Amino acid sequence: QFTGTGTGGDVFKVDLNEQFDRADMVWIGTASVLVWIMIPGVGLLYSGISRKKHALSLMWAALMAACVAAFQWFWWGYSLVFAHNGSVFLGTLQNFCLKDVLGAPSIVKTVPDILFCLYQGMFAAVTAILMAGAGCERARLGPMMVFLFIWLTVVYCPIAYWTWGGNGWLVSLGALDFAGGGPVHENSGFAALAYSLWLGKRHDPVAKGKVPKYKPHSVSSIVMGTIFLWFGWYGFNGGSTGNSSMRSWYACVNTNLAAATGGLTWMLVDWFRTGGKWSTVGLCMGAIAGLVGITPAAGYVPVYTSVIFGIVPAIICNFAVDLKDLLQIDDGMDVWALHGVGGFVGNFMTGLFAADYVAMIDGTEIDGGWMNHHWKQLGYQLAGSCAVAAWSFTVTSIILLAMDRIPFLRIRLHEDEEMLGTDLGEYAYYADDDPETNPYVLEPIRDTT
Template sequence: MEKILKLAKFAKAVVKRDVWEEQANYDEAIIVELSIATAMVMFMCPGLAYLYSGLVRRKSALHMIFIVFATLAVTLFQWYFWGYSLAFSTTASNKFIGNLHNFGYQNLEVDFGGYPELIFANFQGMFAAVTTCILVGCIAEKGRVFPCMVFIFIWLTLVYCPVTCWIWNSSGWAFKWGVLDYAGGGPVEILSGFSAFIYSWVLGKNKPHLMMNHRPHNVSMVTMGTAFLWFGWLAFNGFTCLTPSLKTGYAIMNSNICAAFGGITWCFLDFRINHKYTTVGLCSGIISGLVAATPASGVIPLWASVILGILAGVVCNFSTYIKVFLNVSDNLDILAEHGMAGFLSLIFMGVFASKTVIGYDGYSDHEGGWINHNWKQMYKQIAYSFACVGYCCVVTALILLIMDRIPGLKLRCDEDAEERGMDEDQIGEFAYDYVEVRRNFFELSSITKELKNNGEPVTPNDEIDENGHNINEVNLVPLDAISNSNNNSSSNEKFTKSD
């Protein structure tokens, strides 16, 4: 028995020593960099939650926060379960999607170029999470939560993972062909923007009477969400090169330039119509610039970012009319700000990609774009962009149309639920307590008027105005009168549509 215990202790010591020897071979700078970057990119998800919450009516504000955080949880589960393997496994026998070699984070490389593959898998999981959190904004004001969560899991498996494999897996056809997509113009921006537009199309148009006087209920939350996004986006773009290098700083600077010029351009375009600047317009322009920088920030020179930022502000601003032309209720302009900006940037790189900038990480080698006389790069960028758009639109539409016909997975809430608000119908909680209080106030006022019109006394010595409101006291309606009153009409009809 003593010999067995000694042998066990020796084996434990050997294993421990082997682990420490493996760690000694790691590049600690890369591990720290990617770990911090993972946390920073995750911060984009709360940013999207607050951005979307501020843009909708107050009675649907909590719904948007909930859906983004729920999407984050579902995405991380899918990524651990088989998403990473389908996107990045290197043992697949085709150029379109990986296999299940890394199912459940199994068989990950101990040394993945100076750092453990687990660190890379975690970092890429945040990219998938940001993509889906962008996408789910399309259910604002009218979408059900549970079907959306089912859709996210399926969509990641059938849409996001294959396209990610195309461009970021060394076995993918776009990677082998030499397509440039630094941080996700295809997998992140085009897929989220165009898939959200398809989801909005399947959900159907907004009810006109519910959107009367519709406006963002809290612009302060919009600015806070944009700030979180900008903060996280610097890691999203800056650390995509994986190793600490000149390209890290270059990508961050390109992102800031695009964001600045995108925001300024959008503001001026809005000013020409209303002769006033808008905070929402500034935030929209900043986000459009950051989106445009995503595939290009590690590829183009700094001066080209000025052009890209201005183009992003113009193109994305005018792209907000696409939903009007096609009669689709894309409430949060996800197609305009994400899909179109990502598409624009991929094409832009066909001209302005620089082989010098591409090589700033110390290991990448590419011929660049037209500014380096690589004339064939443009058609590669165009073909890849349209492949992403076509694939995601067709597959997303098929998933949604099939789901919407399955009992229990109907995508849209009924009209009564939309009028009451998504917070009450889907969440059962409110972002603001006074939403419920205000509704109850109007219910009591209506009951008071009804009792007065029926000739029934409310309380002695009350003064009732012509609208049925008690002038002397706030609430003098007997509880038994309230419980026995006829309440056939929905309470939603007693408060304004802009709540």
């Protein structure tokens, strides 16, 4: 009388909760709340790190992104990823507006559809604020909200379906992605790169010549953002087992250790490159790099290897940030360097260090990586990383270029039509300017001449 389809059965005839371990459900419910607070974590981080004055407050934009993402997910985002009648590349509209989303075992069988919807919806929201942060410079809010809705639909949801969907081709191939390093981090990173290369300011003074690599808008925002991110990451990674087993807590140990060693590695790198100074910004970026790096691996690799997921992503991401000076582009490039490069590196190394005896902690069966002489695992990881980066960069490019040719949907005004943050007899007046007291978004204005 448990149907396994639709709502899962008739609530007046069966107790749909009997299909699940109650403790499994509580941990995934708790983990969903933890991921939610990562959303303002992202907004605080990238507002504080910025080397220029964004007119849009990214702390506030995180709440905007939480609203847009939750509506998109309810509307059809959840269905396009986690419908049960998917087609290798995408889901369907079977769960449009969460129709019949209730007590059937989800793609992750240990939790019902409705709880998996709550949990996975937080991942989409985290990705939404990463994208708004990447593309925030001189953004117009109306076009940005439309962009987020579309981008979640045709960039996030296909990549997420490939990684997590019932018939997703990356699942079937054998690619490993424990907590969504592809859909969340690598995807947003390479979409950010599309923003940088197509819409970011060229020959940017903050990135041109010998300018300071770190010039933060607000160190206290960076620290608070990193606090929220690390705190929430326990749900992000620890919840990706779908259960209450000790593999969940194993993945939390790996998460903590990769962040710790990433933070120390990046700071040590900067200590050598500067000739002896201690980078406060660097420690935080290094913790994020390690957190990103361990994301595809946390439930698959032995604890002692988690330090490598801090060390190696921190080193590589540290040097990836230097490319901003070569391109002379700042906009969007921090998100690409931490999440795009970091996610690529972590996904790659999961193919090296994944171990079948770690997955088996809760009975999960995998062939393993190079730890289990499963050599082609590395090739499965590279196939996933290249497909994510290619789809994300290409489709995000198309979206941005299409909207740029529609004057009322142009996300970022062209320089020749831009007007200095003015406000609506014969003279005009300024509406300054202090985001701490201004109740309205300082929206870019188009020139009327």
